[PDB]
Amino acid sequence: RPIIAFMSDLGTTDDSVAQCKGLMYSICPDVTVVDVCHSMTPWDVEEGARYIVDLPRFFPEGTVFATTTYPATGTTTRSVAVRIKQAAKGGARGQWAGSGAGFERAEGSYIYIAPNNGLLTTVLEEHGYLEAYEVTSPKVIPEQPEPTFYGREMVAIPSAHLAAGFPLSEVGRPLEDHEIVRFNRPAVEQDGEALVGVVSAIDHPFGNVWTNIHRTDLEKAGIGYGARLRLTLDGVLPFEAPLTPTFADAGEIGNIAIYLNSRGYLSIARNAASLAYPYHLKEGMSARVEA
Amino acid sequence: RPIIAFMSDLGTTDDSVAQCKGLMYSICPDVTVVDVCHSMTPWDVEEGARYIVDLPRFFPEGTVFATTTYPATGTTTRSVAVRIKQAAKGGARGQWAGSGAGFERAEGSYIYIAPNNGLLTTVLEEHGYLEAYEVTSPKVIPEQPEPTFYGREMVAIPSAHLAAGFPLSEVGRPLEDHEIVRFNRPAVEQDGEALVGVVSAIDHPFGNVWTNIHRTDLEKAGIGYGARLRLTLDGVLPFEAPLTPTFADAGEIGNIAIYLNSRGYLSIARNAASLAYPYHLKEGMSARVEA
Amino acid sequence: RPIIAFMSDLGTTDDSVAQCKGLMYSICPDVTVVDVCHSMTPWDVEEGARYIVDLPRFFPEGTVFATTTYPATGTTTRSVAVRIKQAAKGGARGQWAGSGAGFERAEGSYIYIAPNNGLLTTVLEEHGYLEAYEVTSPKVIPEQPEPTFYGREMVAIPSAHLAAGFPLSEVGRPLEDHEIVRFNRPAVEQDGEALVGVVSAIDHPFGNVWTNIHRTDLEKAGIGYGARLRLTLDGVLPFEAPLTPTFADAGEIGNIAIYLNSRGYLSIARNAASLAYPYHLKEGMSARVEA
Amino acid sequence: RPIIAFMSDLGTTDDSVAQCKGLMYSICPDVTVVDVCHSMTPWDVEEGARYIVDLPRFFPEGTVFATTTYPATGTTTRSVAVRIKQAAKGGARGQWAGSGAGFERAEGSYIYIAPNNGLLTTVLEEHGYLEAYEVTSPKVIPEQPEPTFYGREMVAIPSAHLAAGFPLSEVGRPLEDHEIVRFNRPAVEQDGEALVGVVSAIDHPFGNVWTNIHRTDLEKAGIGYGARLRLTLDGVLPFEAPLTPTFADAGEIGNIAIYLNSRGYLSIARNAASLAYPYHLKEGMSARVEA
Amino acid sequence: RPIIAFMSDLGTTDDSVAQCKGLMYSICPDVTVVDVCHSMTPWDVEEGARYIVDLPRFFPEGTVFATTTYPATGTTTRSVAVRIKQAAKGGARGQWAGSGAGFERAEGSYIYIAPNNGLLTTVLEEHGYLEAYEVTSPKVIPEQPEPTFYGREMVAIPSAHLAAGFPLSEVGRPLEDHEIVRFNRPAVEQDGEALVGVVSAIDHPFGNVWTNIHRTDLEKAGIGYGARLRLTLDGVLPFEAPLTPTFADAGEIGNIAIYLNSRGYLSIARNAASLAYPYHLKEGMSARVEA
Amino acid sequence: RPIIAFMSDLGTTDDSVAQCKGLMYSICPDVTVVDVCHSMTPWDVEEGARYIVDLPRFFPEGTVFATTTYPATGTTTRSVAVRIKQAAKGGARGQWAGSGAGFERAEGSYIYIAPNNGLLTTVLEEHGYLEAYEVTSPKVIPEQPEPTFYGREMVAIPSAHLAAGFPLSEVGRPLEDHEIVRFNRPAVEQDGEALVGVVSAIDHPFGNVWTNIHRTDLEKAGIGYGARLRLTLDGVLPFEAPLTPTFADAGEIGNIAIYLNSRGYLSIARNAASLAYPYHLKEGMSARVEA
Ligand SMILES: C[S@@+](CC[C@H](N)C(=O)[O-])C[C@H]1O[C@@H](n2cnc3c(N)ncnc32)[C@H](O)[C@@H]1O
Ligand SMILES: C[S@@+](CC[C@H](N)C(=O)[O-])C[C@H]1O[C@@H](n2cnc3c(N)ncnc32)[C@H](O)[C@@H]1O
Ligand SMILES: C[S@@+](CC[C@H](N)C(=O)[O-])C[C@H]1O[C@@H](n2cnc3c(N)ncnc32)[C@H](O)[C@@H]1O
Ligand SMILES: C[S@@+](CC[C@H](N)C(=O)[O-])C[C@H]1O[C@@H](n2cnc3c(N)ncnc32)[C@H](O)[C@@H]1O
Ligand SMILES: C[S@@+](CC[C@H](N)C(=O)[O-])C[C@H]1O[C@@H](n2cnc3c(N)ncnc32)[C@H](O)[C@@H]1O
Ligand SMILES: C[S@@+](CC[C@H](N)C(=O)[O-])C[C@H]1O[C@@H](n2cnc3c(N)ncnc32)[C@H](O)[C@@H]1O
Ligand SMILES: [Cl-]
Ligand SMILES: [Cl-]
Ligand SMILES: [Cl-]
Ligand SMILES: [Cl-]
Ligand SMILES: [Cl-]
Ligand SMILES: [Cl-]
């Protein structure tokens, strides 16, 4: 039966996540709580967004995503709960997840609940939504919420009510689209025949380097598997390799691989060695690619 | 059905916790195991105590708390199993947890099982207890326990029998109050109009600063929300701010907030910035407060 | 209910493990997923092996072990799925796990599923096996597997089918013994009457030192409890103590203990203090022992 | 005998400084070379300036100051050689250096030779000058200067000729005042009645904190010895103490002292303990002071 | 002609030492200033003492030792100036320094000038003294000394007057023996046949380990070259080697050597490898030796 | 008059270098001791060689180079003293050092004294020699040398006698060429049109990267200033730039410069930024260059 997938900035160094889970099991006795991750940089909504955007196609229909970083905790702000539209295919190629031909997911089958602070920006961009509500009903949140713990009060608790079958439309008033806070997503720019983006993430624990340059950005340049690329990082450290599906395509252990990661984005790595860690490469460094 | 909430010093870098879990599912097939945390400083009973004392009000009645750091592993020592009295309200204000008016918890509704080494000191202080037993019966522990793994043998295994409905009074003989080991809890001193305590913890991953000065100590001084405080850390850092419910009350990002944390304790932080990390503030540093 | 115990190198800093879990619940709705650990050094098959070899006796019969580090992801390689023979006793002494006299486990009661890259080397050595198959059927893996995520495609997904009762023999063709990749396990040598091995691991979070010198290597050498030992580490740092069952046997806090760990191997520690961390002792350092 | 006092960014990890010295003795055999320091942050002209501005009153008349960080090495740029006017009193109080009443120094008694890159900015501001020349004559520099070693070619070599009595006016053409490159010296601001500046330096090896708030800024603001001050660092860390002449005035070891350093600037310290190091205080952090 | 050997806690990261030197050349134009070292832990008089006690036999007669760490700077304290008695033999064996049979040094041939804070404790112990004066005359120190720079005002400046031939007896009044401040030197204990001391120092940059167990303590036990020793560090590291004159006597590179250092003290090292650095051995650790 | 340039592995954290200097002034009262450097990695003869090979052309004729790392201290080995032949031009271009056309140095004008352990390998290679002697005479070394301090006994002391005019041929017997120990100098290899060497050094404090690829190696490939080069480091981090005389030729601050350093070797840097430090580039990394 019901699943809550829980992504927070609470860490795993104290009992904070367990407090939320205790309440989730209290409210929805049959629930399964799946940890997404609790290690994001606090208050970094763009990073939290990366951990939650790709999730729906992996989960059983009816799954509730409880997703929180809440620096405006204790203020008059209230969470947003949305039923997304498209589960959405994903991966380097763009497909359903699972055995055989994959598991097709029906539309309108997932709910996200989150602070209304832009955390859901890319979820809404990539999946769309069918309905959105402000979370205000004392049936689903505390009458006297703990000031410093709104992720528990305004996300974990109401997520468990939704998992327990509390009607989404009863959590509070519908929100107009402009009332849902979004963050600005920096565009990949074309610079002659080059594409210019950033390092979006270091892929821990491996030290692979992920960029914000999407497959679609490459397809738009006619760059496909086999293309010899020059990928320049930090505007000083350059790299040369063909675009390949995987790490082993580089040949010898330690050789440079340029590939599409499992999220659909242009990435660079060493084959069975860490690229990022020895050279201290970091998120936010410039990333330029050209054939 | 049954829940075991599991707090240990085992970490999550090998299969130790999984070994305990396997045995829990072996003994109580329908159990749900909830991780509290496994990252405590080993052998620091005062720190372990902080991760378990606030738990009961969050959990369904009948939950068993399996809580362990066991430096006396492999000796003639035996664990203690206690049925607590008051589930106890908590928070900055002192309330039940949950939506609406919160979930009131019945008395005598939770069991803790732990080494008899002081780990349960504050649990017993804040909740009281109705009965306490030494854990000795070969029905609930190994006849030949692994010398170096008493958290598994003397806590995890018998917790699962308890969760499965093994009668608490049958784990072994009743313990008199003086036979339950306690650690000394240093008091918050009165020093004129001031209060003198310590930094109890750095609140990871945020770098908030928690003190052992409780709301009840503040009340003794008549310090309420709105009072302008000087909070001096480490003897030399006279921070000045009013006592506010939350971080955002400090105004601009990075401004100092003095507040009551979600555990009921006087704390200090910066608004959506880390206080402790840039200046390497630490547990054990002195903390003085005055109006 | 069915259990999957999941060991990977995916870490816990993003949604990787949760994607695997989502698919596990999709395929086998009544499953319980137990995390073994996700923190292993990527691509270190010998380390991964250490985290999985001791598991079976702790788990209910029918448990599926999904175990992966997959540096050959996206290649023509296919996973191996084996039903092990002996659940196998373990510990410092060699016993069944659990309360009373322990829980005996029937033969042929556990499946491991893993990359065919040597990860299962010690599992097969210590437990033996009844049957082994290559994992190829589109009924249990994707027809179009994600190139960079074979742990999910070729381990997590099929493990969930096996947990749901998919016949093991139907995953693909039987593998001959020589077709199952092994790593070389470096032997404990004798230099005269000294036993010469290595530091196999630092036991986090404690800083205990584990060697690859097993109880049986000691028995062959005529060393039992009470024997005064000289244990030399890194060909530099000497330590002297009798062989004892546990840490507290050393007397005062900080005193050296030489002992058999819970996995059955010669180890060294300080009593309730860290040995490894102050001296920066490491996995791979030489370890020599003599009576 | 002639003295060259030598300040560079060359460090002391190779033979760089010794190459300069060899040439100094070659050109001026009776010279004494005094190391000022060689550890400055490379290319940080403001830091280099701090190490040289206070020197003249300490040295015998006729001393040549050879002072260099040379990031424009190998370009068409040429060094500037100046004879300063006032030797200038210094210290917390403003006095001549030395025993008795100190050693008065005659005007026009010192030469500085440096890259024309702003290094001499504060030297000229605090001392003034009588004459300034561009260093171009092949009598005092190489006809074929080493491209990457202009500190040696254009500072060390000519300084040795000047020490040996080569007429200053013969090194090259006179420079007009506007032709001498200056850096902007960021002013101490007033925010109401608070003086607002920066941490100018960490005083190694002690971990004292130096600000750019000078004795005269204090005098203008009506602050003298005995005044109770609140000094805030990094817009976060507050400290409170009276202004005192020295560290021991703070009382117990570890107590906060706010003082005028030996260069005449407002500074903060712990009495015989490091302030900066435990709190990781740094150059460039804001510093605010108020009575 | 005259030599001042200068040891301070001033470091070499700014112009502090250069300021002292300028004043030395100002007062005594023909002086040679020799840096002893400037890198001592500030305020650690025992460490400063180790850098100056072995000096006299290496220097020409008439050398002045200017030696300073001055945490009491700016108080009513005044330096002490002493003419030592015995230049004293030194080394592992106890000999004069130099070629041939060494350079015998006359008695009463060296002056030390230092804060009266215990810095000269071991100088006076090992050399004795013939006369001692408080440094007060405005002929040799500033009438208005810089409060925060007493090493310059009360040591460097008067050292230069002394080097210039200013009569020692004229610096101020004679001091009685009890007026010369000393630090306590912990003894090397006899413990059965064993000797119990400490690690006095890590010998940088090699990472050799020096003890406070002197050749004369070894002689008391009849421990000579060739004796097989157990040297235990930090309480738990029973190193075993014969006492040898030098490192290479240990044989293979990396082997343990136990030796008498160039200062006369029992020490331990590896042959052409670092002992202290890999295992983070430290000053203050216990050191026990027995045959 | 006489100069001794002193290069050792003694560091500057204690009085070791000062002990040697004391003796140098004792033996040769008129001497000037110039520090080359004391910070080399102990026992690394190849590194020590780099700090001393380029020195002669900078120093007055008659200069004695006292150069030591002595891991065979206390053994029967004895130092070598050589009169070199060619002073040798140097730099990126190959010229005399100094003002005007530079200072031409006569042949046979410099002596090196060093352990006979290969330290002088490159000195002898680049300068040649006219005579070489084993240093054994009790007129120039101690009759009873300190076992652990042969750099003082067998280098510093006899260097001072040579500076004082002791006849070189009287220090001991002449050495045949094969009796002078040399280290192996790895060749730069041609790999098609590429040159393959190593990173010889990180140029501290700047973080420039120096290779063992000489100007002559470039001239041999017809690579001159202006040539577009691809310089690959560590076999993964590549770089592209024209060969230029200096850093500023790169344009903007932070741009990659490929140049000939002041020692004559192909090097790579960022313009007024550190290359090595952010990417943790190190000595011993591969360096490949191609036009
Ligand atoms: C050794 S740990 C068990 C997990 C370990 N990774 C293993 O596989 O054996 C078990 C218990 O021993 C205690 N322990 C661990 N190291 C210890 C030490 N050096 N001294 C005393 N107790 C220790 C811990 O607090 C814990 O309660
Ligand atoms: C304080 S944390 C609650 C867990 C905490 N360990 C506890 O036991 O109370 C709750 C929320 O506060 C936010 N938060 C934490 N520290 C903050 C700070 N200094 N400023 C703004 N928000 C903060 C976090 O993002 C999180 O969403
Ligand atoms: C890339 S990780 C998948 C999780 C990743 N964070 C993601 O979202 O795509 C999948 C498998 O690839 C392997 N892997 C990761 N980096 C690798 C590299 N640089 N070379 C070879 N294999 C690698 C890992 O061992 C793991 O089994
Ligand atoms: C290269 S350093 C000379 C010493 C060096 N160790 C050598 O032997 O060649 C000479 C001058 O170049 C400057 N310099 C060094 N690295 C630089 C860089 N990457 N960009 C600009 N200037 C630099 C320094 O400031 C210094 O003044
Ligand atoms: C401040 S240092 C002088 C050099 C400093 N860089 C300057 O320019 O003023 C002078 C003396 O003060 C002492 N000193 C430095 N910091 C101190 C502190 N925080 N407390 C007590 N003494 C200190 C040192 O031991 C030294 O003897
Ligand atoms: C011991 S150091 C002398 C300085 C030392 N700080 C002292 O006061 O005695 C003298 C010589 O010993 C060599 N040395 C130092 N430690 C060594 C070791 N562990 N093995 C071999 N040689 C060593 C060094 O290279 C140096 O040339
Ligand atoms: Cl929260
Ligand atoms: Cl345990
Ligand atoms: Cl994977
Ligand atoms: Cl330079
Ligand atoms: Cl001083
Ligand atoms: Cl030496």
mmCIF file of C-alpha atoms in Angstrom, chain C residues 230 234 236-240 254 256 270 278-281 285, chain E residues 230 234 236-240 256 270 275 278-281 285:
data_model
loop_
_atom_site.group_PDB
_atom_site.id
_atom_site.type_symbol
_atom_site.label_atom_id
_atom_site.label_comp_id
_atom_site.label_asym_id
_atom_site.label_seq_id
_atom_site.Cartn_x
_atom_site.Cartn_y
_atom_site.Cartn_z
ATOM 1 C CA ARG C 230 53.372 -9.089 19.802
ATOM 2 C CA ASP C 234 52.923 -1.092 9.099
ATOM 3 C CA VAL C 236 56.852 -0.007 12.187
ATOM 4 C CA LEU C 237 54.368 0.307 15.091
ATOM 5 C CA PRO C 238 54.620 -2.497 17.673
ATOM 6 C CA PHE C 239 51.925 -3.437 20.241
ATOM 7 C CA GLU C 240 51.960 -6.156 22.967
ATOM 8 C CA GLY C 254 42.927 3.491 26.571
ATOM 9 C CA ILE C 256 45.614 -2.047 24.263
ATOM 10 C CA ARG C 270 42.277 0.568 22.664
ATOM 11 C CA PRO C 278 45.319 9.229 16.467
ATOM 12 C CA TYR C 279 48.033 7.185 14.664
ATOM 13 C CA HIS C 280 46.419 7.366 11.205
ATOM 14 C CA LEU C 281 46.458 3.581 10.808
ATOM 15 C CA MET C 285 49.237 -1.760 6.226
ATOM 16 C CA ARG E 230 62.526 -1.412 24.709
ATOM 17 C CA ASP E 234 52.602 7.128 24.351
ATOM 18 C CA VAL E 236 51.473 1.517 24.105
ATOM 19 C CA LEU E 237 54.365 1.379 21.554
ATOM 20 C CA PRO E 238 57.208 -0.945 22.795
ATOM 21 C CA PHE E 239 59.885 -0.226 20.181
ATOM 22 C CA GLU E 240 62.813 -2.562 20.208
ATOM 23 C CA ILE E 256 63.958 1.605 13.724
ATOM 24 C CA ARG E 270 63.562 5.363 11.287
ATOM 25 C CA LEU E 275 58.911 8.083 12.301
ATOM 26 C CA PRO E 278 53.067 8.964 9.548
ATOM 27 C CA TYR E 279 51.833 8.074 13.068
ATOM 28 C CA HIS E 280 51.372 11.653 14.321
ATOM 29 C CA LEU E 281 53.732 11.270 17.288
ATOM 30 C CA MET E 285 53.847 11.864 24.854
#
